[PDB]
Design an enzyme around this catalytic site. Structure first.
Site, PDB file in Angstrom:
ATOM      1  N   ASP A 289     -21.663  16.080  29.471  1.00 23.28           N
ATOM      2  CA  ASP A 289     -21.718  16.928  28.273  1.00 23.28           C
ATOM      3  C   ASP A 289     -23.151  17.384  27.992  1.00 23.28           C
ATOM      4  OD1 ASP A 289     -21.174  18.183  25.824  1.00 23.28           O
ATOM      5  OD2 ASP A 289     -20.256  16.384  24.980  1.00 23.28           O
TER       6      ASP A 289
ATOM      7  N   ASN B 256     -14.109  22.968  23.658  1.00 19.04           N
ATOM      8  CA  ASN B 256     -13.941  24.329  24.233  1.00 19.04           C
ATOM      9  C   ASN B 256     -15.010  25.352  23.829  1.00 19.04           C
ATOM     10  OD1 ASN B 256     -11.610  27.044  24.348  1.00 19.04           O
ATOM     11  ND2 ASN B 256     -12.523  26.006  26.117  1.00 19.04           N
TER      12      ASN B 256
ATOM     13  N   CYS C 214     -12.254  20.804  27.799  1.00 17.43           N
ATOM     14  CA  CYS C 214     -13.139  19.771  27.263  1.00 17.43           C
ATOM     15  C   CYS C 214     -12.756  19.493  25.783  1.00 17.43           C
ATOM     16  CB  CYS C 214     -14.638  20.119  27.468  1.00 17.43           C
ATOM     17  SG  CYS C 214     -15.266  21.619  26.647  1.00 17.43           S
TER      18      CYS C 214
ATOM     19  N   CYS D  79     -18.629  24.469  25.328  1.00 19.38           N
ATOM     20  CA  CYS D  79     -19.717  24.193  26.297  1.00 19.38           C
ATOM     21  C   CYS D  79     -19.192  24.253  27.750  1.00 19.38           C
ATOM     22  CB  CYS D  79     -20.430  22.830  26.012  1.00 19.38           C
ATOM     23  SG  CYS D  79     -21.333  22.637  24.418  1.00 19.38           S
ATOM     24  N   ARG D  80     -18.774  23.121  28.283  1.00 16.72           N
ATOM     25  CA  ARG D  80     -18.389  23.026  29.673  1.00 16.72           C
ATOM     26  C   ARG D  80     -17.164  23.845  30.081  1.00 16.72           C
ATOM     27  NH1 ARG D  80     -18.258  16.521  29.634  1.00 16.72           N
ATOM     28  NH2 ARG D  80     -17.488  17.161  27.570  1.00 16.72           N
ATOM     29  N   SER D  81     -16.065  23.768  29.350  1.00 14.62           N
ATOM     30  CA  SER D  81     -14.811  24.394  29.809  1.00 14.62           C
ATOM     31  C   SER D  81     -14.870  25.947  29.872  1.00 14.62           C
ATOM     32  CB  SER D  81     -13.573  23.864  29.050  1.00 14.62           C
ATOM     33  OG  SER D  81     -13.533  24.072  27.637  1.00 14.62           O
TER      34      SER D  81
END
Length: 164
Positions: A136, A22, A19, A24-26
């Site tokens: 996000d 690097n 993301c 939150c999501r990834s």
């Protein structure tokens, strides 16, 4: 025991989750995928990592809000934010990102390198429920992190089983 004890080992597969930041999501997708492969006795056949399209968060641990979500689900994350490199495009079979801004950015990058081995895809392109974009949660709340986590479980599972 013997190298001929079980079926002959697969060449290692590699996946990098990406993301913008690097944090939150990834990292959540990384730790979800790593659990799966560790639980199924095949972590020695995977190189698993995550990285950022930008350098804004380099060195930082995961978002504390995402960490709390993952700790609820029993998968604490141990990750230091890092930015994607040129080598990454040459070394990973898959780079799997979260959203469309991510994909345009990575596609820009892919064209500045000599060897792009990686297949660059959206992670949600693996979701059986067809939720394409993993949104996000940076400006969201605890249920937005839960959503992302659940999307990541569906998508990493289908990816593991059946790669594009």
């Amino acid at each position: 025991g013997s190298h001929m004890e079980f079926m002959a080992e697969q060449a290692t597969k590699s996946v990098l989750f990406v993301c913008l930041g690097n944090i939150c999501r990834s990292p959540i997708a990384e730790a979800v995928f790593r659990k799966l492969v560790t639980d199924q006795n095949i972590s020695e056949n995977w190189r698993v990592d995550s990285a950022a399209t930008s350098g804004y968060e380099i060195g930082n641990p995961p978002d504390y809000r995402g960490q709390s979500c993952m700790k609820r689900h029993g998968i604490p994350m141990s990750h230091v934010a890092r930015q994607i490199t040129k080598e990454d495009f040459a070394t990973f079979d898959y780079i799997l990102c979260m959203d469309e801004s991510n994909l345009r950015d990575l596609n820009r990058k892919s064209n500045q390198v000599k060897t792009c081995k990686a297949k660059i895809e959206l992670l949600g392109s693996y979701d059986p429920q067809k939720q394409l974009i993993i949104e996000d949660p940076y400006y969201g709340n605890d249920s937005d992190f839960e959503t992302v986590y659940q999307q990541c479980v569906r998508c990493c599972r289908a990816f593991l089983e059946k790669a594009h």
